[PDB]
Write a protein that binds this ligand. Sequence first.
Ligand code: 402
Ligand code: SF4
Ligand code: SF4
Ligand code: SF4
Ligand code: SF4
Ligand code: FES
Length: 573
Amino acid sequence: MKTIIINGVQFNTDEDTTILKFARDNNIDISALCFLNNCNNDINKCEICTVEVEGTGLVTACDTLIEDGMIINTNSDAVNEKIKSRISQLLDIHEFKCGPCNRRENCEFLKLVIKYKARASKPFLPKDKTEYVDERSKSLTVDRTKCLLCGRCVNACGKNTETYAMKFLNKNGKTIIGAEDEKCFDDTNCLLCGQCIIACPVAALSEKSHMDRVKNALNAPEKHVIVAMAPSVRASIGELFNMGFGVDVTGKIYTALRQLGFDKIFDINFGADMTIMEEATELVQRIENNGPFPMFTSCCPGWVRQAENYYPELLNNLSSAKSPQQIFGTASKTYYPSISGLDPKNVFTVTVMPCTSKKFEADRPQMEKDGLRDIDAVITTRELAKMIKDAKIPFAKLEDSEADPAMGEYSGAGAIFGATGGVMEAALRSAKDFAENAELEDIEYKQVRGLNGIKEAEVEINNNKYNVAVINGASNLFKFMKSGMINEKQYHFIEVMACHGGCVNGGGQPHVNPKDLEKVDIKKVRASVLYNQDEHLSKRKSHENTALVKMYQNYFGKPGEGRAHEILHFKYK
Ligand code: 402
Ligand code: SF4
Ligand code: SF4
Ligand code: SF4
Ligand code: SF4
Ligand code: FES
């Protein structure tokens, strides 16, 4: 048992950890910036975590182990002068104009400037940001006037995806971050998954705005503007309204969307029940067809890009069912006019997504029919929050309202889509019923839930055993393939999400303070809202969705055939 003194207080512990981790395990205030995902900016360490060790001098707390006899001072003048200097030198390369900034309310660097009363040696007042801004992508943007060069996005890309699509670059003898060869991210192997945004402590990385599309549509008197939110939005957007973590705010969202002027309040969970209808039907067809196996899910656009960029040989094995977003959009321009009288050309369909990659998917040229886009605009969870705040809507106290049912009702199978393994579980609930011509009461598939990187299970379907796998994160897709794990057995159905934890941890989600991430399992607590909804919903199978059944009976017919096969499917070449 080593004995250490921090700020004159004695500690006796048996732990082998850093000074930073021990301090925040014992409520001792140590600042940090570049340390995230268990790694600091190995090159160009920010040194904001500086503490003093007697007999040693100034050290970085985030990567220095505690030792016996250590005497630490976290708040001496020499320490605070050094930290203040590092922040001051960051201010020298930082456009400190918080008023119109999209991180004004939850910025890690503003918090540090205030804490240490840091002050630039010369204010950075760039006069034309076009040199600093890259908005070429359909999903991501870069504003380098805010970039601290802390490396958190580069480390997060490598850790979360193993593509290293975010790189340090040498541009005119100066270090920047960007895509390979400073190209548009879309034109590289980048998945557009936005995990680099999530890792960013400032507004140097953002989603590509679709707020112009939405604003103009709401202002056009002939446009009838539909809005529909992803599963995960209702389990996360309250974090940006001081409501805490894990709060179900579904009903408040419906009310806020009406107060914003949208003409119909639907739900992408209805599209999730559609995807299950088509995809579970396809799985049964492949089973009766003895292949081809495996079938991969096709609903994650980051996974689709990963397949396109790294495993093109797998593209024909992707399910032909459109993603819940695109399958909903297709039906919004065809079935919805048939029950409303709207001119299809005047319908404007907006989705709210926890995801930046969904903007690329919606803008794919072939994602349209008769000149009408499936989906006209995609705003992130963060974008909707700003929308509500700009309209001065008191979100935290809104009364609950319901969705418009026609394309708004959803089963519990659709509700869990946002968590890793949720698509797999939802698909199995319908597929087993379909294949066995039965109504089975045992529907919970806990074996595919959870935060394990690769999850596998053996399922019995119509007196035969099948192998399924759930791949939780793009880096785990690489591991699954490169290790030969896809060859330990014959796999028949495989779910892939590019974001660890599923869509609840998507690239369009609210940022979380690094000190909140050490105390809150954000993947688990956001997902728990969705699993709770499934528990309490009166329908827990996608093919039991009353409004969906009515849509197929009156308009699309039976899944996988005819009209459904005609327009609700999409294949990648
Ligand atoms: N389309 C679609 Fe999906 C559905 O429903 C979302 O909206 Fe997802 C979420 N939340 C996102 O982004 S995509 C991948 N499959 C799981 S969930
Ligand atoms: S990134 Fe932060 S410190 Fe910089 S202008 Fe925006 S809110 Fe202010
Ligand atoms: S873009 Fe953000 S995460 Fe990346 S180096 Fe700049 S400040 Fe750090
Ligand atoms: S969007 Fe995803 S794949 Fe692309 S650079 Fe960012 S983290 Fe990497
Ligand atoms: S897991 Fe979800 S949030 Fe992440 S890239 Fe895929 S669809 Fe988007
Ligand atoms: S947080 Fe320790 S060197 Fe950056």
